Amino acid sequence: VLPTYDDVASASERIKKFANKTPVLTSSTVNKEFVAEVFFKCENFQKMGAFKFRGALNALSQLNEAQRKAGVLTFSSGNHAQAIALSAKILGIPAKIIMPLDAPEAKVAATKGYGGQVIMYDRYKDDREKMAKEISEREGLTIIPPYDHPHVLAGQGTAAKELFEEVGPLDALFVCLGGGGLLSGSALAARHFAPNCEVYGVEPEAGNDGQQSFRKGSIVHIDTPKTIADGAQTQHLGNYTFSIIKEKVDDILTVSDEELIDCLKFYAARMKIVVEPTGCLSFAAARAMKEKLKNKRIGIIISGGNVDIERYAHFLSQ
Amino acid sequence: VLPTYDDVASASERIKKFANKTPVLTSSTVNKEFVAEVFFKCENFQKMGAFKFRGALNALSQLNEAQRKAGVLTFSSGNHAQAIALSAKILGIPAKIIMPLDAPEAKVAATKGYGGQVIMYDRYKDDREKMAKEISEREGLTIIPPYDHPHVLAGQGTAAKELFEEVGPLDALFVCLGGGGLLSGSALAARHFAPNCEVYGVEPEAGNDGQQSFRKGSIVHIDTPKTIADGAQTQHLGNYTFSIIKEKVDDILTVSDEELIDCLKFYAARMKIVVEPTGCLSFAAARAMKEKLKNKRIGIIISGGNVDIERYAHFLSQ
Numbered sequence: 001v002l003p004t005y006d007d008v009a010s011a012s013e014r015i016k017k018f019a020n021k022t023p024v025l026t027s028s029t030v031n032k033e034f035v036a037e038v039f040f041k042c043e044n045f046q047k048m049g050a051f052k053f054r055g056a057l058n059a060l061s062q063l064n065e066a067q068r069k070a071g072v073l074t075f076s077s078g079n080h081a082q083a084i085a086l087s088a089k090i091l092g093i094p095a096k097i098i099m100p101l102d103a104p105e106a107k108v109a110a111t112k113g114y115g116g117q118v119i120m121y122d123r124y125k126d127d128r129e130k131m132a133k134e135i136s137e138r139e140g141l142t143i144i145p146p147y148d149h150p151h152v153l154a155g156q157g158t159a160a161k162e163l164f165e166e167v168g169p170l171d172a173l174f175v176c177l178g179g180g181g182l183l184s185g186s187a188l189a190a191r192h193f194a195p196n197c198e199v200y201g202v203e204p205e206a207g208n209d210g211q212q213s214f215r216k217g218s219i220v221h222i223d224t225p226k227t228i229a230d231g232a233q234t235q236h237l238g239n240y241t242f243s244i245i246k247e248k249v250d251d252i253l254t255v256s257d258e259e260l261i262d263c264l265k266f267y268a269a270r271m272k273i274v275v276e277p278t279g280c281l282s283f284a285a286a287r288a289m290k291e292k293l294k295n296k297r298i299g300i301i302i303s304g305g306n307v308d309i310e311r312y313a314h315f316l317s318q
Numbered sequence: 319v320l321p322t323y324d325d326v327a328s329a330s331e332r333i334k335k336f337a338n339k340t341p342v343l344t345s346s347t348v349n350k351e352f353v354a355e356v357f358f359k360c361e362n363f364q365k366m367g368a369f370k371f372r373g374a375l376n377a378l379s380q381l382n383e384a385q386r387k388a389g390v391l392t393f394s395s396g397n398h399a400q401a402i403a404l405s406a407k408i409l410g411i412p413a414k415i416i417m418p419l420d421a422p423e424a425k426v427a428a429t430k431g432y433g434g435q436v437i438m439y440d441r442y443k444d445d446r447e448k449m450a451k452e453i454s455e456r457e458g459l460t461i462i463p464p465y466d467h468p469h470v471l472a473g474q475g476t477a478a479k480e481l482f483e484e485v486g487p488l489d490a491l492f493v494c495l496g497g498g499g500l501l502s503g504s505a506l507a508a509r510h511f512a513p514n515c516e517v518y519g520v521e522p523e524a525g526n527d528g529q530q531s532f533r534k535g536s537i538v539h540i541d542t543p544k545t546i547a548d549g550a551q552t553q554h555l556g557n558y559t560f561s562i563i564k565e566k567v568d569d570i571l572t573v574s575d576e577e578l579i580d581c582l583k584f585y586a587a588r589m590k591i592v593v594e595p596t597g598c599l600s601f602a603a604a605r606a607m608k609e610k611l612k613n614k615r616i617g618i619i620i621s622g623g624n625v626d627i628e629r630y631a632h633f634l635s636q
């Protein structure tokens with residue numbers, strides 16, 4: 001019913017031949033600011049540009065021959081789509097990707113570069129799911145959840161696992177929260193390598209459905225939030241994700257878009273790395289409570305760096 | 319409080335030096351199908367490509383010197399934006415246009431070609447209104463409603479006025495319904511030239527907030543509908559529009575996207591004209607009740623032809 005550190009440890013072994021052991025970056029500037037030692041696990045450097053490659057590969061690596069021969073299909077507007085496209089190509093599995101007619105050029109080219117078969121639909125009529133069900137059932141294609149799947153969350157969790165192995169136990173771990181895949185998997189690693197670690201999920205304040213769920217004790221749904229963290233606009237947590245979250249997550253924090261923008265610029269000018277808006281949640285939340293992190297070892301996950309260069313330029317000049 | 323045919327008649331005089339007297343097209347094929355005579359007022363041929371030029375010009379032509387010197391601002395994702403841009407340029411009024419970072423190239427080029435000063439914002443964070451209020455108040459800019467304004471609806475109404483003048487009284491008139499500007503103004507012309515005319519507004523079935531309002535007797539709001547009629551995705555009717563609608567509109571009809579697509583292809587292959595999805599509502603509704611239109615004279619308004627060539631190609635091949 002629920003994955004454990006073991007699955008994360010196995011996922012590590014299962015994806016080792018293809019995943020990147022992303023670097024852990026450090027900033028003397030950040031440390032002085034926090035009066036502590038901060039560690040950044042940079043998944044923006046992961047294959048495809050986001051941690052998602054982990055969960056996607058782990059899940060696809062566990063499909064049977066019939067499914068692998070038939071292929072998979074994805075319709076997510078987020079990083080999961082290219083995570084699936086690239087993993088599928090790596091594993092010799094055909095992949096169909098449903099994208100909006102006006103999808104960013106770079107993302108479309110990336111997807112075709114990964115061998116994905118692009119099927120387009122009109123954004124104004126978001127009947128993606130309808131199309132996905134019709135197509136996947138008619139062609140016997142498999143659809144891997146972007147977060148609410150035991151194999152997917154175990155894979156995402158391998159990023160946290162690697163962090164600790166390189167740096168060691170931690171007092172706190174800040175992780176981006178959308179559907180909960182990264183959050184749940186990261187919790188499994190944390191509780192193992194450093195049982196005395198405060199684990200925080202972070203959501204854009206305009207969409208704290210996760211926070212309400214955490215407090216309510218049951219999954220709460222909300223209208224799609226208006227925020228620049230395009231990768232964290234989910235409307236509700238997943239069953240498998242929330243279960244692990246309510247039992248291993250200490251608390252869900254929220255940050256404003258203004259803070260995300262400040263973090264995005266800091267990463268670029270001060271750390272020289274490109275990070276997408278959603279990937280700034282964890283750092284923003286951490287900075288907000290730095291006064292409470294004196295002389296501790298903090299971990300910050302940078303979920304990804306796939307930001308349309310135009311939006312990136314736009315935010316950098318804000 | 320409410321405009322009358324008179325305002326429509328004056329609007330006609332007020333915009334005459336710049337608006338196009340769009341043609342009325344006829345199809346023997348459509349007539350045989352309906353066992354009647356059908357008349358198409360083609361506003362896709364209007365300046366800027368949509369009827370909106372009428373209401374925009376009429377409204378801007380009535381601003382005082384201080385406002386004209388200060389300029390206007392628009393943030394609509396629909397045809398109203400370019401209607402304002404072009405009208406403002408024609409009248410020597412500066413215009414600032416708020417558009418999404420990923421707005422279609424052609425629309426952006428059209429807007430700059432009309433002398434509009436483009437200000438972009440991130441689509442994922444739709445804080446347009448916030449920005450519009452801050453900017454318009456700080457620079458003393460005027461914002462003309464896309465439909466809920468007496469001057470705007472009177473202008474839109476001039477299209478219906480011209481139809482009757484060229485063809486004569488009608489038993490029925492089918493008009494696209496979004497916010498109600500075109501619907502209300504058209505009602506004023508109809509009741510004048512042909513008091514015995516059935517006037518129908520038409521909305522995409524997925525967003526019949528107008529229909530519910532018409533039945534409820536009071537404006538009903540709804541979540542943005544998923545439909546290809548991008549120009550009719552409004553969430554509620556306007557005060558001035560609904561008032562005229564409840565008193566001069568016989569009934570609000572709805573059609574499916576499938577029907578819109580069929581009409582779009584018919585216009586292209588059978589009538590050789592380019593029409594945007596939203597501009598197909600009225601024709602679709604009419605075809606659906608053609609059995610009830612035998613030996614009558616029907617009027618059909620084609621609201622516009624501004625469809626991204628990519629979506630157009632996509633729909634044509636559906």
Ligand SMILES: Nc1ncnc2c1ncn2[C@@H]1O[C@H](COP(=O)(O)OP(=O)(O)CP(=O)(O)O)[C@@H](O)[C@H]1O
Nearest residue numbers: 020046047048049082106107109110111113305306
């Ligand atoms: N054809 C294309 N056009 C534009 N962007 C592309 C692209 N193909 C890939 N990308 C993007 O460029 C980056 C490429 O990452 P990718 O992870 O596939 O390999 P690399 O070549 O960087 C891997 P490695 O460092 O692990 O050897 C990603 O952020 C991806 O979204």
Ligand SMILES: Nc1ncnc2c1ncn2[C@@H]1O[C@H](COP(=O)(O)OP(=O)(O)CP(=O)(O)O)[C@@H](O)[C@H]1O
Nearest residue numbers: 338364365366367400424425427428429431623624
């Ligand atoms: N630079 C540009 N790039 C792409 N499309 C443009 C454009 N400038 C205008 N358009 C579009 O092309 C069409 C141009 O209409 P416009 O009404 O301004 O003049 P015309 O040159 O067709 C007027 P007229 O026939 O009344 O003399 C519209 O549908 C508009 O949206």
Ligand SMILES: *Cc1c(COP(=O)(O)O)cnc(C)c1O
Nearest residue numbers: 079178179180181182231303304
């Ligand atoms: C998918 C994604 C997230 C959210 O992860 P979940 O497992 O849905 O909570 C955060 N940041 C980026 C860059 C993502 O692609």
Ligand SMILES: *Cc1c(COP(=O)(O)O)cnc(C)c1O
Nearest residue numbers: 397496497498499500549621622
């Ligand atoms: C704006 C628009 C409509 C809707 O008109 P309203 O006055 O909002 O009801 C319909 N079709 C097109 C092409 C439009 O641009």
Ligand SMILES: [Mg+2]
Nearest residue numbers: 045046047048
């Ligand atoms: Mg790389």
Ligand SMILES: [Mg+2]
Nearest residue numbers: 203207209210
């Ligand atoms: Mg949320």
Ligand SMILES: [Mg+2]
Nearest residue numbers: 363364365366
């Ligand atoms: Mg023309």
Ligand SMILES: [Mg+2]
Nearest residue numbers: 521525527528
């Ligand atoms: Mg409606």
